[PDB]
Amino acid sequence: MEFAFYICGLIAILATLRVITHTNPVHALLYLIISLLAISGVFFSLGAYFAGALEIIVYAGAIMVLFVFVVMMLNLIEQERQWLKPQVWIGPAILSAIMLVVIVYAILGVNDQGIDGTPISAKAVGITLFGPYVLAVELASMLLLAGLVVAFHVGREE
Amino acid sequence: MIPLQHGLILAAILFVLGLTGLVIRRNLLFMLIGLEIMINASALAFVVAGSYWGQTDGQVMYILAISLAAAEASIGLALLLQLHRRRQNLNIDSVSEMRG
Amino acid sequence: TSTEVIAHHWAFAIFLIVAIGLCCLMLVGGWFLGGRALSAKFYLVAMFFVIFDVEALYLFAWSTSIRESGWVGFVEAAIFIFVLLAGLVYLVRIGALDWTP
Amino acid sequence: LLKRDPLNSMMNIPAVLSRFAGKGLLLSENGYLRWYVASMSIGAVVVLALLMVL
Amino acid sequence: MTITPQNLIALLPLLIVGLTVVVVMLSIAWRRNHFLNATLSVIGLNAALVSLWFVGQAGAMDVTPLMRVDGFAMLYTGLVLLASLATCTFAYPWLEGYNDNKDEFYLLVLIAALGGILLANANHLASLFLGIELISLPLFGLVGYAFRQKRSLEASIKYTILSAAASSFLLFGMALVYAQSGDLSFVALGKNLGDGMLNEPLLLAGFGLMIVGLGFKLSLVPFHLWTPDVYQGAPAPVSTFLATASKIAIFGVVMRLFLYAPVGDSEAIRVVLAIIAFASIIFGNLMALSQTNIKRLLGYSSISHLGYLLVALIALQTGEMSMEAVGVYLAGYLFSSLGAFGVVSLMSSPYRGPDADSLFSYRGLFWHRPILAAVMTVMMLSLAGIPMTLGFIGKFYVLAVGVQAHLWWLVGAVVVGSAIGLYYYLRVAVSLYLHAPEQPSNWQYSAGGIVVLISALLVLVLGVWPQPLISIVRLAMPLM
Ligand SMILES: CCCCCCCCCCCCCCCCCC(=O)OC[C@H](COP(=O)(O)OCCN)OC(=O)CCCCCCCCCCCCCCCCC
Ligand SMILES: CCCCCCCCCCCCCCCCCC(=O)OC[C@H](COP(=O)(O)OCCN)OC(=O)CCCCCCCCCCCCCCCCC
Ligand SMILES: CCCCCCCCCCCCCCCCCCCC
Ligand SMILES: CCCCCCCCCCCCCCCCCCCC
Ligand SMILES: CCCCCCCCCCCCCCCCCCCC
């Protein structure tokens, strides 16, 4: 379980690094799908089986399909490759590195008994979701309705 | 057997990668892609935290996070389609006239 | 960790790698051997698929623990599905799910 | 030497300082979304560093 | 815990607003009637206020591991509902001028009111996250409701990108806090730390990322640069709803979070919030000095007023009257910003189209509409903190809370920023009574007019006579 976790984490990091630097949008979305598949593998390593199934079904299988659809209908800044020359990403890269080093300083120093990896099934997640999480479920349906209304209002052609 | 610290650090790495991808790109599409990276990293961190304690709450927060990610991706791609159909240009620095 | 579960893990891994290797070898033998010589409705449909897929995930999570949730959970899913059907009805009547006007 | 009220001018100096500071601060409202995201990340860095120091 | 019938009797505004959403949506599916759908929205919000009265007849209880309802929650729910009702009232002439679909605006406004109610009753990280998303994404729709307008599309893109980034920051911070604490309840955020170990770095960094997200949502420096562009680009009723309802609901749930979290009295977070409040007050007041646009000026004003609110928040655990000060200030700020952005709304109504300019030109407003000039002047004096207005009563409350907690740097910041505010607010008012060089007839425009006059009368009356509002806020104590 540690083996799959570490290879999938490394694949996700590498794929994200190719995502944020690539020039072709379809290639970047393909690397993003690869990173999502790796993150699902990480979820399956931890025992969150429902989370991994949802990472493939919902994130890679719906959201990235929407991004892919938008890129295809765009038929697509690319030529100069601004983000490749160091005079553009000199600042943001070290800024993100400083933020990352402060965050991982906070990570190092906490109680860590390790993750057992015992599978938390989707049935227990359903009992929790439809037990002590009634208002999260109803208002999450409410939120998705809001997003649907907004995206139809903005994205229709006329 | 897996440390919580390593999963949290992996989520932090993906979060800061999404943040710098959000900043450095003039194209709005790559900005939306970086936003998706950041929110997926946050959801991953919640899954790691929930799986460490043996609780269902991490996957529940993951479900709420991906609901948010789906809705925000929908709205952002609608706005990107509007920008492309009204300006024929996805340069985000051209959308800058309000200032002062 | 029983012997059966690690046997099934090995079988699943072998199934994965044999399927992927068979497809890749099939294309490799195809290439190596031989003789050389849009409207916004698409975005709306994909977007509706994404939103209703997340609602479907909530229904997935409910469905596997019906006997452990009672009638209260049925009521919870009842307002959930009622709001889902209200949104679907809204999309149908406003012409969002109408490919031909 | 005292026909133009020098004490009044010295007490009017903070108004000049306020106008200069406001004009300097208004340069950061350039209207660029990328700079707004960059300033959010800079503020995140500052807040995290200040919280880790104390 | 589970749900009882009495727990359903402690849940009515949420259900009423949700059923209003469903009913308005089905009525849109029936037919596209602007009048009927707007009326159904305002009856639903009024019924939610009456439901607040009915749950005020009931007691205070923990309705979920998520929700907790007490008089604190009813007060913030009432503020959010009043803001939403004013937004619908101002939006009707604006949407009358808008030559596209109009009732989706009301659907998103109601959904955002639902999220504000959730934030008002939130006692849990999941509920706080969900309420923040529920007020954010309808605002993505509403800020760019007139997406064909180039300024509104710019504001929509800016607010959507920056709020998605802030939601990512807040979610990451919540994940780190849950990684430390092991419980998403507010009262357990630091419970497993004892013997002076309250300053654990993971809890502090998680709270820092949440502070980044929330301070974006509260227009706190340096997460404030979005505020003038988004305020100016958004529709004027949308600017009203943002400035009142979103900031009030998020600051209420921030008040609750810093109240019941045991990590709320750590010195590091207090010092960081003090620096943020100081910078917010000074920067907003200094940046509003040379503004000729009323919407950008009100954005900088919102930055300064949220700095004053933060000053009231810092003195929570040291003092006692801090939450009462926050309530009184929130009432005064709600009425003042309601009146101000309401005059901005009615003078920009009806909507003139995506191509026509929405410039205000407040100079000489008295010589063609005297009463709106009077109400604009009254709210300009209220946001300045002149003693004849309730904005001064809030300023006096936060000054008393800063004096009691000996926050002398923040008190001096309040005085200096107040003087700079005097300059720019009085410039706006005297410009209203200047001479303009050169340059309606319905009853909903008159409804917006009587709304801003009622807000002026309330702020003036509670400026001269503040005791009823003080006794209203004081009885709204929560479950300690
Ligand atoms: C080989 C070197 C690298 C070569 C290049 C990369 C190839 C892909 C590498 C990643 C995927 C495979 C990782 C290795 C998995 C091998 C099996 C394994 O380790 O299983 C352990 C565990 C079994 O389950 P459990 O009951 O917890 O057992 C623990 C102890 N009994 O398993 C689990 O708990 C979960 C098992 C993993 C999750 C399912 C599979 C996820 C696949 C993700 C693919 C991502 C995209 C790859 C793209 C490649 C091109 C860039
Ligand atoms: C004796 C020392 C101990 C006691 C100290 C007592 C302090 C309180 C009493 C004294 C206050 C002094 C204020 C001085 C400035 C007064 C305002 C003023 O002169 O405004 C005029 C000026 C606008 O002029 P105009 O040319 O029209 O502007 C360009 C656009 N047309 O306006 C401007 O240019 C902008 C004005 C901005 C707002 C005014 C400045 C406020 C600064 C902070 C004041 C608080 C006290 C700070 C410490 C003061 C010194 C000790
Ligand atoms: C064992 C027999 C039980 C019979 C009664 C079952 C139902 C009782 C509890 C009903 C709870 C309903 C909760 C509805 C929440 C809706 C939230 C909407 C938010 C917008
Ligand atoms: C406490 C509130 C104090 C300000 C009230 C402002 C509104 C009062 C009613 C309107 C008065 C208008 C007077 C206009 C006079 C213009 C004179 C021009 C020629 C010198
Ligand atoms: C740019 C505007 C700057 C405004 C600064 C306002 C400063 C006002 C005066 C603050 C004085 C604070 C004194 C604190 C003394 C604390 C002593 C503690 C002893 C234990």
Q: Which domains, and CATH codes, for chain C?
A: 11-100 (1.20.58.1610)
Q: Which residue of A has its CA nearest to E144?
A: A154
Substitution target in A107, A130, A142 with the highest count of E β-carbons within 10 Å is A142
> What are the chain D neighbours of A102 within 8 Å (beta carbons)?
45, 48-49, 52
> Angle CA(E5)–CA(E81)–CA(B72) in degrees, nearest 5?
90
CA distance B5 to A115: 10
Distances (CA, A) of E172 to B46, C61, E165, E202, E454: 8, 24, 11, 11, 43
Q: Is residue B100 part of a domain?
A: no
CB E92 within 8 A of CB E449: no
Domain that holds residue A75: 1-155
CA distance E429 to E379: 9
Which CATH number goes with the domain that contains B19?
Answer: 1.10.287.3510
> Is the Cβ pair D37, B23 closer than 8 Å?
yes
CB atoms within 10 A of CB E347: 17
For E28, which of C82, C83, C90 is closest by C-beta distance?
Answer: C90
Which CATH number goes with the domain that contains D21?
Answer: 1.20.5.2700
Domain that holds residue D17: 1-53
CB atoms within 10 A of CB E173: 27
Domain that holds residue B62: 4-87
The DSSP code for E187 is G
Which CATH number goes with the domain that contains A58?
Answer: 1.20.120.1200
Q: Is residue B54 part of a domain?
A: yes
Distances (CA, A) of A83 to A80, B23, E310: 9, 10, 38
- Say which residues have a Cβ less than 8 Å from residue E5's Cβ, sequence separation at least 6: none
CA distance A30 to A53: 19
CA distance E263 to A89: 37
Q: Which residue of A has its CA nearest to E129?
A: A136
Q: Where are the alpha helices (DSSP H) in E263-389?
A: 267-287, 294-314, 322-347, 370-384
Q: How far is the CA of E395 from the centre of ligand 2 (A)?
A: 20
Do chains C and E have 3 or more beta-carbon pairs under 8 angstroms?
yes
* Pocket perturbation via mutation, ligand 2, pick of E282, E423, E427, E428 by most ligand atoms within 8 A of CB: E423
CA B10 from centre of chain: 15
3-state secondary structure chain A: CHHHHHHHHHHHHHHHHHHHHCCCHHHHHHHHHHHHHHHHHHHHHHCCHHHHHHHHHHHHHHHHHHHHHHHHHHCCCCCCCHHHCHHHHHHHHHHHHHHHHHHHHHHCCCCCCCECCCCCCHHHHHHHHCCCCHHHHHHHHHHHHHHHHHHHHHHCCC
* Domains contained in chain B, number: 1
CA distance E137 to A139: 13
How many residues make up chain A in this entry?
Answer: 158
CA distance E245 to E224: 17
CB E321 within 8 A of CB E403: no
> Is the Cβ pair A154, B79 closer than 8 Å?
yes
What is the full DSSP assignment across E103-142?
Answer: HHHHHHHHHHHHHHHHHHTB-BHHHHHHHHHHHHHHHHHH
Resolution in Å, one decimal, please.
2.7
* Cβ of E465 less than 6 Å from ligand 2: no
* Domains contained in chain A, number: 1
Q: Which residue of B has its CA nearest to E182?
A: B53
Sign of the torsion formed by the C-alpha atoms of A40, A44, A46 and A49: positive
Ligand 4 atom 10: the closest Cα is on which residue? E374
Method: cryo-EM
Q: Is residue B18 part of a domain?
A: yes
Q: Where are the alpha helices (DSSP H) in E197-293?
A: 201-217, 226-233, 236-241, 247-260, 267-287
Question: Nearest ligand, CA of residue E374?
Answer: 4
Q: Is residue B93 part of a domain?
A: no
CB atoms within 10 A of CB C59: 14
CA distance B34 to B44: 15
3-state secondary structure E29-88: HHCCCHHHHHHHHHHHHHHHHHHHHHHHHCCCECCCCCECECHHHHHHHHHHHHHHHHHH
Substitution target in A24, A59, A135 with the highest count of B β-carbons within 10 Å is A59
CA distance B35 to B45: 15
E69: which 2 tokens? 């309802």
DSSP-derived 3-state class of residue E308: helix
- Say which residues have a Cβ less than 8 Å from residue E88's Cβ, sequence separation at least 6: E38, E41, E42, E45, E106, E109, E237
CA distance A4 to A15: 16
Q: Is residue B73 part of a domain?
A: yes
Q: Is residue B94 part of a domain?
A: no
* Domains contained in chain D, number: 1
Q: Tokens 């529709």 belong to which residue?
A: E235
From the number of C-beta atoms within 10 Å of its C-beta (0-12, 13-18, 19+), residue E125 rates as buried
CB A31 within 8 A of CB A15: yes
> What are the chain C neighbours of B70 within 8 Å (beta carbons)?
50-51, 53-54
CB atoms within 10 A of CB E411: 18
A14: which 2 tokens? 């590498």
**Interface chains of chain B (3 or more CB pairs under 8 Å):** A, C, D, E
